[PDB]
Curated annotation (Swiss-Prot), chain A:
Coiled-coil zones: 7-49
Listed name of the protein: Spike protein S2'
Variant or mutagenesis effect after changing S40A: In strain: Alpha/B.1.1.7
Protein task: Subunit of the fusion protein that is processed upon entry into the host cell. Mediates fusion of the virion and cellular membranes by functioning as a class I viral fusion protein. Contains a viral fusion peptide that is unmasked after S2 cleavage. This cleavage can occur at the cell membrane by host TMPRSS2 or during endocytosis by host CSTL. In either case, this triggers an extensive and irreversible conformational change that leads to fusion of the viral envelope with the cellular cytoplasmic membrane, releasing viral genomic RNA into the host cell cytoplasm.
């Protein structure tokens, strides 16, 4: 535990990138989070929305 | 731009549509600035037989 002041700086920067990547799975209220899925389900004007 | 069409297919005369009229007869651009005006012409354009 004594060296943990450097280890926490490593941990926060790993957690920050994992949070940034996990947010690719979110819909944000869209029909899907997968971009090719949106473009397969819907025609151009609705897919753009 | 002027033509006769079937009353059902008038919906294809709009930006970002797909179908036999949209893709094989008359295609509007997605960023269209304009007005689409239609009227029924059964008294002019139909024939007995």
């Amino acid at each position: 535990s004594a060296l943990g002041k450097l280890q926490d700086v490593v941990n926060q920067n790993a957690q920050a990138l994992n949070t940034l990547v996990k947010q690719l799975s979110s819909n944000f209220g869209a029909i899907s989070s997968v971009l090719n899925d949106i473009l397969s389900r819907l025609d151009k004007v609705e897919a753009e929305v | 731009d002027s033509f006769v069409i079937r009353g059902d297919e008038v919906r294809q005369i709009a930006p970002g549509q797909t179908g036999n009229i949209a893709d094989y007869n008359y295609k509007l651009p997605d960023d269209f600035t304009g007005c689409v005006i239609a009227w029924n012409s059964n008294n002019l354009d139909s024939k007995v037989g």
